[model samples]
Target chain A: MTHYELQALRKLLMLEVSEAAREIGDVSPRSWQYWESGRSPVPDDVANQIRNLTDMRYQLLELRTEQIEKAGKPIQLNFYRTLDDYEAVTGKRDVVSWRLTQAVAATLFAEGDVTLVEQGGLTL
Target chain B: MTHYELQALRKLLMLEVSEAAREIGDVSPRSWQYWESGRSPVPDDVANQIRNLTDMRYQLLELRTEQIEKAGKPIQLNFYRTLDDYEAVTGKRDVVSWRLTQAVAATLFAEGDVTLVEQGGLTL
Candidate 1:
């Protein structure tokens, strides 16, 4: 996505610039400013991260809605920081922290285990 | 793609640094070298251009092979510099020169219109 699109996604997701930067692998907020303002080209990896995160958010939203409709209540999403938690859900280890977070989100949401939405407290 | 993968694509295409730079929308050879060496991050636009051009080349090769097999003759691809030629096939006039060339290549090759491969002489 272009810089404008990136900014739009961040706004659409109701995320502060710092929050978005941290989720996208701890990219500096200044670098994100540079990218959003077109002071510098958005690096490929950064762009990929934004796209992936956006996609993940969309998937979560869809899954959440589906689960809520079936269960007749809004289910809270879980995001874990511990590797053991990730391994318990995914049966694998050696994953990056943020990716593990995504895996946990995906796993929980897919299994209709959404409960207790956690704030930005993970190490990601 | 990663830097190493980008460099590998350049090598597999048998293009010198300068040639690849020109093909990927006039990126400076020095910038290409920096991206390849990981001295500077590869920009998303540049990466997309490289991927598109690589995909075009593969399609051209496949089309050429199929045409030769069916026609029992060697077909040469024609890349046009004239906007008129691009419009003749694509019916569009406002395309960038390099994109027009790709379109011309695709149009001609698909129609078994291969005759001679032009070298890097267009204003790409």
Candidate 2:
């Protein structure tokens, strides 16, 4: 169950173990794979992190992917409240980054604009 | 990815395919296994439902597990916003179910209070 739960959050982030490994600790991808596959135990704290991240989900209600991504930065130039949400889920703030840059997005999620996929992908 | 993403929400709800099959149209568990195993395509609608449900997550922040379950009904006697949340995620109100009764709970969840387990099992 823990393995599947971690896999759940990983997929939600559009990440494979390789990406999550790099983001969470820059740890080895095999380590994450081990967790997801249940080849090894999911460390308690790691499982806790996954639980926290998975539990904090929300979305742009009734909004289109185009609308959300129309702006280069989903979090407007001046209003970066989005960072707060990111920090709440991921303990990192990237306060140094005023924009939700590619690097941060890559670290936190898959490096593509699958925002639309997310918008309707789960409503089935 | 779709397989894992569905798995994410399923585990979050503490449900196995056997349970989800009975609740969601009473489909066969093997059918879901096919989806989760990626042996077959995940129908668009089912994937959408998983995404919708996954996107709407929340938790009892900073609350102890015992405190949440100390009461017989987590929804309390008169206040059933809990049902509203369940309905939003599950699309079934069980409005007929004024209380979060065992049967409805069984239909919707793993039939026992794994509530405390959910609270921090993932906060790693």
Candidate 3:
């Protein structure tokens, strides 16, 4: 994508320059600035991630709109996650369930669904 | 919820000491630690956010599993976001689309859904 297109995408996502770099898995914000300024080409992988994530945003918005129309009103669904389950799944201890849930939810929403069974059931 | 229950919830979410504090909307990590250690009572609202976010995690996991089964393979969907769309919706400028998508998707996935139309069409 051109720098103009990249800038437009960045603004649409409402992220700062550094945050956008981070979101695209760029460790060096300076390198991202170079790409933004047309000083260098953005690595293919990084650019692809940005494009993919942008695409995901639109899909999520459409799905969310569809869901709202289907419900015709707001709806709330509930579920539970226990410590034992987390430990069993992630094999990690002393981690905060609440924050991890936020991170997981954030990631899954942005990246789309991940297959736990295919990934061997979240044995992280 | 009791302190033990809160602690277990924290562990299940896999957040660290200060991180969990922020996740629950606690203003101070020290205050959160106090609650964790039974020296202070967590206010109802903060506790509620934690429980609610945690509930969202399980719902997301179950939905993800169901989607994977329904698809019988992982699928990638694509869409797009435009600067005009974000500016029209949010009245914000110079923000990156990728991060905003992450934040919006995070909030939507966690808190269920928001009414764009009932709220007068995202006139933020």
Candidate 4:
């Protein structure tokens, strides 16, 4: 997608034009308006923030979709290393429960009804 | 896990005594050593940084594991909202590609070699 198109998505998701302006290091909302309107190009640092945010969103979507598809299943301990890496980044080990719930919620929000299941079969 | 044990795990993963010091903004590596060795408790600000970083790592690992277990799969497209939230944090868009590869790699690294595939059936 073009830079402005992505910026539009950010504005929609983050929902504060002022926050977007401050995020790229003081590019005021009017300046972003020019870029969003295709009157000018996005600056480098702003582009960096946009790119990184987009990456995070895509990854979360991919993982959540996979989780929803496999809901109500047994633990796939085969993927423990991924869990280890996640523990490294979040500083919390027990977030897996929330991840599962969020996955189901996202599925229902984006698509149709989804079956939400508790991990290890108890609603912690 | 307890605070000290978590600090030890960070040491193991990040593997740089100096980087850890800088992350909490001017805490010395020696102080981290104290925390690691259980000579003292971790400070509040340092704990916040550690907790946030740990949260990111754990989320990555959790998503990666779900992806690996559901490998050789089609797109679910039901979890777009989760992706939306992820994008809010990271600033890049195509990371779904890397997330999948990393998931498989994590499985292989921690457990055994597994099948690797590309998104939409092309290596790129």
Q: Which candidate is the best by TM-score?
A: 3
Per residue, candidate 2 scores C-alpha lDDT tens digits across B14-121 of 344776565542479998887765577777777666544433322231132344456454421112224564465446865323222222222112212333222223
TM-score of chain B of 2: 0.44
DockQ of 4: 0.02
Worst 10 residues of 3 chain A by lDDT: A115-124
Q: Candidate 3: where are CA atoms >4 Å away?
A: A74-124, B1-124
Per-candidate RMSD, Å = 19.6, 14.1, 13.1, 18.3
Candidate 2 regions exceeding 4 Å error are A59-124, B1-124
lDDT tens digits by residue: candidate 1, B33-111: 8887667887788778766655655565556567667867755554533456556655676344434244435333323
Model 4 chain A: weakest 10-residue lDDT segment is: A115-124
Question: After best superposition, candidate 3 residue B1: deviation in angstroms?
Answer: 31
TM-score of model 1 vs. true structure: 0.31
Q: Model 3 over residues B6-117: C-alpha lDDT tens digits?
A: 6545543434457667545546788877776567776788678666756655665455446546756542211113345446645764233322332333333323232112
- In order, the B-chain TM-scores come to 0.53, 0.44, 0.54, 0.50
Between candidates 3 and 4, name the one with more favorable TM-score: 3
Would you list the C-alpha lDDT of every candidate in the order shown? Answer: 0.53, 0.42, 0.47, 0.42
True contacts kept of 3: 0.00
User: Candidate 2's residue-wise lDDT over A1-124, tens digit each?
Assistant: 4554555445433344665676653479888888876687778777665544433322221132344456554421111224564455446775323122222222212212332121213221
* Tens digits of lDDT, candidate 3, A1-124: 6443454445434344676666564567787777766678767776676566566565654555465467675322111133454455456642333223323333433233321111132221
- For candidate 3, give the docking quality class from DockQ: incorrect
Sliding window of 10 residues with minimal summed lDDT for model 2 chain B: B102-111
Best by lDDT: 1
Better of 1 and 3 by lDDT: 1
